[PDB]
Amino acid sequence: TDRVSVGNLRIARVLYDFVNNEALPGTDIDPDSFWAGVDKVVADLTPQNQALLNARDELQAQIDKWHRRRVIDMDAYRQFLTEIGYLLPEPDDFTITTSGVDAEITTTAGPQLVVPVLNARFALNAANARWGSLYDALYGTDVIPETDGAEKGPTYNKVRGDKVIAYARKFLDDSVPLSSGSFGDATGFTVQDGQLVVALPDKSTGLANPGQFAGYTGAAESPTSVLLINHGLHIEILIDPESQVGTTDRAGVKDVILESAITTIMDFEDSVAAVDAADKVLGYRNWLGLNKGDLAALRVLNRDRNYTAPGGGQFTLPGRSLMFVRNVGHLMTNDAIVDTDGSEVFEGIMDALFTGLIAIHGLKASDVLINSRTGSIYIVKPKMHGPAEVAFTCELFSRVEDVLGLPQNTMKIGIMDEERRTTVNLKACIKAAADRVVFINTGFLDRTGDEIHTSMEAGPMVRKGTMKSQPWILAYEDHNVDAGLAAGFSGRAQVGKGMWTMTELMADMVETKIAQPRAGASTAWVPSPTAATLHALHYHQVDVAAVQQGLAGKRRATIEQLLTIPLAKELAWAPDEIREEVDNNCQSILGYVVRWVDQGVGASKVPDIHDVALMEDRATLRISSQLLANWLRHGVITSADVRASLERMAPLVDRQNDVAYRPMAPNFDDSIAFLAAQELILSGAQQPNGYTEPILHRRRREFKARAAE
Ligand SMILES: Cc1ccccc1C(=O)CC(=O)C(=O)O
Ligand SMILES: [Mg+2]
Ligand SMILES: [Mg+2]
Ligand SMILES: [Mg+2]
């Protein structure tokens, strides 16, 4: 075989070599000790990992049976969940004690970017998205409407560009207002006695709050740029009258640069497809290159930014997004390592070991600098159900730290609140990680998937779009904020909210996503560097720190509200509405899955039934498949409806896609990808907690097997 024996484990050769030859050198960790620790940790923790998974199944069985035996008593339901151990006692008030955390996390409110780690180009751009051009983000998106005269063309449109300039001028007025007048009338900027002076047509003025002046570049009397700060976030006005845009500007302003993606989550979970050692190694290698600073795709990582202080001295700001890594959760095994019985090893355990080992490089000098200067490794742990599962993650990290010779608590945990049993036990979950937690985040897409599967037997659910605004989800959002603030997260840890999936609807995002920081979230998720820059605007308009202060002590969600099942009312839909829902889900499912199975792409932009481009990953797939499963289970639709829609949408997806692409139609059953999509719906009710990995992984491996022979 092509495996390496270490104790009871048989490690795929490609993974063994990668760890030894690429990851271990420079960590000062004895290799034999590392591998012994791998075997030991896997041996010691696997039983509890299995027990926790079995507990999920047992609880779901009882809940399924509860709905089945009744013909909607919140009182009785709540007592039942208590009896079975689903709803646990709430612990007394406490405050988290997490330490050694960077300011980007404890203090700074701003955008958080998530990107698939298996795509080096995207990962690189994402790390570099700490700073982004506001002009490019406005000009290149629909935030400036493409009305007549302002449409995008092959070359620069001054009507459009002038609207960009004015938009940003208004942003400056709103964010760092002048003592008198408006940035729109500025004719120049200078630094005099350490104070920013803005020349206006018939006078000059300073800032209403001179403390917002953070620095400059070039000569004080004719700067190349001016640096401002507001709500802890930097804004840089680039000055160059000799530039394409600058020459058209009254003050020669070239661009406005926003500090944007303050942190970035490098994702090994829902936005990547990795089903064997080869895929995991591609991912691990990228994570390694990021932490060593030498990833090159040839584009590379940016250096820090140099500035002159108001007084005349020097300082630097970080050029890169502070990096988290999202490990997989407790569910899946992977055959990258198997034991002597041929049993696959739990992937979550493997990720802790390997991504933790690799992260050590980010704690030390890059030959090309330092991810975490405070000495922490930031791991987002997804898809946990309840406080015991959180405690298990903490014990896993404790054991890994021992293997890696790291101080206890080095490996921090970003807790996704994205499963119902975590939501309804959130305080206890936070308490279980009280010395490790660096965020809680409402992963609302997974949470919706879990909502549907948990009450699968209850009755038919409301349509997917409707889910987005159901009582249960709004309560879940407020409850998360309440719990975090009560645990003392303000100034200590991030309170985060979810992803904006409509990658091209930036005007809509700028209009609507402002609700997130208004709700007291100190970060929320964006799909791209461009969206990070635009979402940053919201943090300039809302003072999140103040909002969190104002929410202190408030309790705005009850357990009854959290437990309100999103069942549909009688006669809710006309036939065309049902057909729309089916087609919409089938389109999104097929569009995502075909690239997953045939190309190993874990995140794709897929137009919905309204031609809206949506960023799809396993969470959104979890919702679509579970919703159709639910409708099939309750007779809203038939298996022929599902068949018809999948077959209808298949050619449109073939059309949307080429090169490595293999069309699904007309020979649907020759397409493993098409059969995968079908399986996800038809077997959806039987998947543990409605998770999509078991099917996707089986089918992707099947496809590789055929393409290989
Ligand atoms: C990264 C991403 C990109 C696009 C869509 C979703 C996602 C998520 O992975 C979201 C998430 O965890 C949650 O809501 O469950
Ligand atoms: Mg059953
Ligand atoms: Mg999720
Ligand atoms: Mg303010």
Side-chain angles (χ1 to χ4, degrees):
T1 61
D2 205 39
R3 290 189 189 267
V4 189
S5 56
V6 181
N8 197 223
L9 299 186
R10 302 296 184 266
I11 306 154
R13 186 62 200 268
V14 59
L15 177 51
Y16 183 68
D17 288 349
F18 165 81
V19 170
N20 286 344
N21 299 341
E22 315 188 37
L24 277 163
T27 57
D28 297 319
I29 293 165
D30 178 46
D32 194 44
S33 299
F34 177 76
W35 288 114
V38 170
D39 173 70
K40 179 58 165 170
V41 172
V42 169
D44 282 356
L45 294 190
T46 291
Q48 164 75 328
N49 206 139
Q50 191 60 59
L52 289 166
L53 294 181
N54 296 344
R56 297 177 185 181
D57 297 336
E58 190 190 343
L59 293 169
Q60 190 61 69
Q62 298 178 89
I63 296 173
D64 286 351
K65 293 192 177 71
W66 190 92
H67 292 292
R68 275 205 303 271
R69 312 313 279 233
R70 61 172 285 139
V71 168
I72 320 75
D73 191 343
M74 181 60 65
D75 287 296
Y77 183 68
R78 201 187 159 196
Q79 190 64 62
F80 171 68
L81 297 178
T82 293
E83 302 297 342
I84 76 184
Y86 184 104
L87 195 54
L88 295 173
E90 181 182 294
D92 302 320
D93 295 322
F94 66 93
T95 301
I96 63 166
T97 64
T98 317
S99 70
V101 184
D102 298 88
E104 285 78 1
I105 294 171
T106 64
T107 314
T108 308
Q112 186 164 72
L113 176 59
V114 184
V115 65
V117 75
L118 264 70
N119 189 316
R121 285 169 210 276
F122 296 178
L124 279 167
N125 290 157
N128 289 334
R130 182 67 173 260
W131 301 86
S133 164
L134 179 59
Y135 283 22
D136 292 342
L138 296 171
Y139 192 99
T141 70
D142 68 340
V143 176
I144 308 306
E146 286 199 75
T147 62
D148 197 280
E151 55 285 320
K152 291 183 253 174
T155 61
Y156 185 68
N157 180 347
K158 184 168 121 61
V159 174
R160 181 166 191 76
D162 285 354
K163 287 172 178 290
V164 166
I165 291 165
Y167 193 106
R169 281 310 211 270
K170 187 190 189 311
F171 160 80
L172 293 165
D173 277 337
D174 293 340
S175 309
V176 187
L178 304 171
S179 302
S180 57
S182 155
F183 282 91
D185 297 310
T187 60
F189 303 90
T190 55
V191 184
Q192 198 178 74
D193 296 329
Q195 311 292 92
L196 181 63
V197 178
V198 177
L200 297 176
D202 289 327
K203 71 191 179 194
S204 293
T205 183
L207 302 172
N209 175 12
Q212 290 194 279
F213 176 47
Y216 62 106
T217 60
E221 299 75 18
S222 194
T224 55
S225 79
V226 176
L227 187 75
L228 309 174
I229 189 164
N230 177 54
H231 298 166
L233 291 176
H234 290 95
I235 298 164
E236 190 174 0
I237 306 174
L238 297 183
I239 301 161
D240 187 8
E242 290 275 68
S243 61
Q244 161 85 16
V245 176
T247 325
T248 79
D249 189 83
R250 285 236 259 126
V253 170
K254 180 181 181 178
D255 202 344
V256 172
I257 309 302
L258 294 192
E259 193 174 9
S260 299
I262 307 301
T263 64
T264 288
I265 294 167
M266 299 303 180
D267 194 17
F268 277 88
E269 195 222 25
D270 277 9
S271 69
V272 300
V275 304
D276 52 27
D279 298 340
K280 292 295 292 192
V281 166
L282 297 178
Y284 290 153
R285 186 174 289 117
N286 286 352
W287 176 236
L288 176 63
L290 287 164
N291 279 276
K292 279 173 79 172
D294 63 4
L295 189 55
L298 286 182
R299 74 162 69 265
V300 300
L301 291 167
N302 290 338
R303 307 267 284 269
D304 284 354
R305 295 175 77 96
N306 299 309
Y307 296 101
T308 300
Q314 304 293 289
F315 67 99
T316 69
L317 298 173
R320 302 167 270 81
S321 216
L322 181 51
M323 297 186 302
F324 285 75
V325 57
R326 185 163 63 173
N327 282 199
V328 306
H330 297 326
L331 177 72
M332 290 299 291
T333 61
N334 193 286
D335 82 331
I337 304 168
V338 297
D339 66 11
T340 51
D341 294 323
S343 296
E344 296 177 7
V345 169
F346 277 115
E347 189 182 5
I349 298 182
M350 292 185 326
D351 277 356
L353 287 154
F354 300 133
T355 73
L357 167 66
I358 294 164
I360 295 170
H361 294 279
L363 306 182
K364 62 172 285 187
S366 54
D367 294 72
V368 197
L369 220 58
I370 300 315
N371 193 241
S372 175
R373 292 193 76 79
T374 55
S376 280
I377 294 174
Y378 303 110
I379 297 173
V380 182
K381 191 68 173 172
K383 297 178 168 59
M384 295 187 290
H385 298 245
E389 292 194 6
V390 183
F392 175 71
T393 294
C394 293
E395 186 55 24
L396 171 60
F397 285 9
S398 177
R399 293 288 303 266
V400 170
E401 292 164 340
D402 278 347
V403 173
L404 302 173
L406 294 167
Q408 286 292 303
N409 294 155
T410 295
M411 297 166 69
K412 301 306 195 295
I413 304 176
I415 298 175
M416 297 306 302
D417 173 5
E418 65 187 348
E419 308 287 348
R420 194 171 182 254
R421 187 152 60 105
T422 283
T423 293
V424 303
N425 295 291
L426 186 54
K427 179 176 194 175
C429 286
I430 296 174
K431 187 180 182 185
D435 49 12
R436 293 186 181 268
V437 59
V438 288
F439 77 52
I440 58 183
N441 185 295
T442 48
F444 77 108
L445 299 159
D446 259 319
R447 178 68 179 76
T448 294
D450 197 45
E451 184 69 26
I452 298 165
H453 194 85
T454 301
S455 301
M456 178 65 66
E457 297 300 274
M461 300 302 167
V462 301
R463 300 177 60 171
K464 185 163 73 172
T466 310
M467 275 299 172
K468 298 304 192 311
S469 52
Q470 286 278 280
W472 74 264
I473 203 171
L474 305 174
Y476 149 81
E477 294 283 0
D478 294 344
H479 177 78
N480 182 275
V481 181
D482 291 347
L485 295 184
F489 275 42
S490 286
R492 297 193 184 83
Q494 291 181 310
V495 178
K497 299 190 175 299
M499 180 64 72
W500 178 271
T501 58
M502 291 134 297
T503 52
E504 319 305 323
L505 301 183
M506 290 297 99
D508 288 346
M509 188 191 75
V510 170
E511 174 177 17
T512 64
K513 185 167 182 73
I514 194 178
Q516 293 179 333
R518 280 179 175 157
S522 58
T523 194
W525 289 6
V526 287
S528 67
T530 295
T533 301
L534 292 167
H535 185 36
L537 300 167
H538 296 142
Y539 297 87
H540 289 291
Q541 205 196 318
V542 182
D543 184 345
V544 171
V547 174
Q548 296 187 347
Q549 288 305 320
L551 291 169
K554 283 172 192 167
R555 174 172 279 273
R556 303 155 305 136
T558 73
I559 187 54
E560 289 70 36
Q561 293 180 288
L562 295 168
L563 291 179
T564 298
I565 299 164
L567 294 165
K569 315 293 183 181
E570 215 80 275
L571 269 34
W573 317 295
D576 65 309
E577 292 185 309
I578 296 179
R579 193 185 172 277
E580 185 183 42
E581 184 69 12
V582 176
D583 283 351
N584 190 214
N585 287 298
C586 284
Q587 162 58 25
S588 299
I589 289 172
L590 275 161
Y592 177 65
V593 170
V594 67
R595 291 169 56 75
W596 213 104
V597 171
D598 293 354
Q599 294 182 63
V601 173
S604 292
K605 300 185 183 177
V606 177
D608 70 10
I609 201 178
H610 307 290
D611 299 332
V612 181
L614 304 180
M615 181 68 70
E616 296 287 322
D617 87 346
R618 297 198 299 263
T620 61
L621 178 69
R622 186 182 177 189
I623 299 170
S624 307
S625 56
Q626 286 296 299
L627 194 280
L628 294 182
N630 173 260
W631 277 20
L632 206 59
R633 162 70 174 81
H634 292 287
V636 178
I637 60 182
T638 73
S639 51
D641 294 328
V642 170
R643 182 64 187 188
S645 183
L646 288 168
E647 291 186 337
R648 246 198 319 276
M649 310 309 271
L652 312 175
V653 167
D654 288 339
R655 185 175 308 165
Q656 292 164 345
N657 291 90
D658 352 77
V659 292
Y661 190 83
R662 304 168 55 89
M664 287 173 290
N667 309 284
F668 309 99
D669 279 52
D670 295 324
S671 168
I672 298 164
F674 180 93
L675 297 174
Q678 183 174 243
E679 185 165 12
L680 283 154
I681 300 162
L682 306 185
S683 294
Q686 293 310 132
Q687 303 311 298
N689 301 286
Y691 285 131
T692 65
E693 290 94 324
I695 298 167
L696 288 166
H697 283 226
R698 176 163 62 247
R699 292 283 181 185
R700 174 57 176 162
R701 293 173 56 81
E702 182 190 352
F703 178 93
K704 279 182 174 187
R706 305 288 82 64
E709 64 190 30

